[model samples]
Target: IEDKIEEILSKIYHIENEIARIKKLIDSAINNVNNNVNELANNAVKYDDASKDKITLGGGATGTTITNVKDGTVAQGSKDAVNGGQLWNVQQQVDQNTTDISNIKNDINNGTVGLVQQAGKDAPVTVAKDTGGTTVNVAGTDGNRVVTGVKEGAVNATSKDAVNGSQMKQIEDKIEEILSKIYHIENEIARIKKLIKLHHH
Candidate 1:
């Protein structure tokens, strides 16, 4: 039974290590996404600014030694305006996603991860000893036992906040939300691609 318990705890420790790895990845991914979106927004604005004052003109031969010059400024102006609007829309989404990224990071670092660490370190489940000459038996808090020389069922306010099955579910939910936000960021980046093509062509 002790070996089996050790196996279970070892698995949990491995899982915690994996979770920590994923948390680092999440941090890096968020930073990269934020940087890319901000760059896209800046590029859009630069293009818009560079084109607003630009003029496009055309010339065509109509007769011998004669040619007509046409002002295509209106068309260029219209294209630039449309591109500006599209870029502005994309910028708004980028800004929103950046804020969301910050919020998600804060929640994970301060709320879920903190609670899990607290539950595991500041609080722990006590393994009680059996006084009988028989094998150890599982008992509830009402049973006689000692945790670090303290009686079983002893309560600590901080320990009460320890991670549990339900909090694990909440952590999973939080991760899913962050994943969804990443997907949304990708979608926004796709729109930026479209804008890039439009702006260049």
Candidate 2:
């Protein structure tokens, strides 16, 4: 059998050795990092993040790498961190917007939006609605879309206010909407006519 008194002393020494090991581990890992010299700089990749919902307090992050950053919330005021893919998505949207605006510039000159190049710029008059219901109509009756009801002479052009293409576009969109409604009304009218023909003929 082993010597009992010597065995107990040896066991105490072994336990004391474990307690010293635990102290050193705590000193390097935590305890305000007193003994640690490198402080995660030299041994950065050797560690990983902690458990779920655990956040590392380090901020002003640099000199470190993130492996795979993901695309996150783009909801209103969410302001979550964006990845490379999200930034690229924004770039594509802006590029499409630039192209769309460029198209408008070309379209306006081509009469796709409305006429821009005025003929002789003789009398660019401003004809607006008055307080009463009756007013001078600017819609050209004879040379329609060519001359906007030019007054008898240019000196009669007192008011020089002009309609912008953008303002005209608003009217155009509303007019287009009304035209679609008229299209539906025309279809319904034809259907009613067919029903009446069945009743008569």
Candidate 3:
């Protein structure tokens, strides 16, 4: 009985450990997907001061930064008009955002490899254990006893399944964030162009 119990528990421990390993990989992949999306946002912005060709640090404008504008005069003029004073070019930010979103989508699609890679971790272990000894008189042998038994196993595999199920949703939300940021920046650029025309008169 003790030997059987040991066998049962040892197998279960391995099963849980395998589940943990797979869950870790899934979680890390999800995190990677999130990171790739953010990278797209960061790489688009050229907020360096030195990138400005015509905008010079005159008077008190020594530490000012400008966008990666090709024509320095127009870039500076556009930069000065925006609510945030002077900043990087809209085109640079838009390009960076687009590239990042693309990379994130690819990363999300590839993350399924992590899911399929570690699928076969658990196998059920079936065992029978004697529950001490109980007296059961034999028909012809007078005072002889036989032992009672008990069987045990995992209740359900639902918990492991639940972990895999929940992770898919987090990946989706991250992708949505990247998509929305791209569109929002594009829309802002359109609005700004219209505003510039209206005020240039």
- Which prediction has the highest lDDT against the true structure? 2
- Candidates' C-alpha lDDT: 0.63, 0.66, 0.61
Tens-digit lDDT string for candidate 1 (162-182): 344555677799999999999
Q: Stretches of candidate 3 above 4 Å error?
A: 1-4, 44-201
| Winner by TM-score | 2
TM-score of each: 0.24, 0.31, 0.20
Question: What is candidate 3's lDDT per residue for 35-125, written digit by digit as tens?
Answer: 9988986556443367665544433546656555344344534553343322356667888999999987766554423322222235332
Please provide, for model 2 over 1-201, each residue's C-alpha lDDT reduced to its tens digit, 9 standing for 90 to 100: 369988999999999999999999887687666435556675444323554444443434665445487777989887677887888999999999999999999765543444234323363322332234554444665654544543333223584444555556777999999999999999999999999888853
Candidate 1 ranges with C-alpha deviation above 4 Å: 46-201
List, in order, the clash count of every candidate structure: 0, 0, 4
Candidate 1, run of 10 with poorest lDDT: 63-72
TM-score of 2: 0.31
Model 1 scores what on Cα lDDT? 0.63
- Ranked by lDDT, the better of candidates 2 and 3 is 2
Regions of model 2 farther than 4 Å from truth: 1-41, 45-65, 115-201
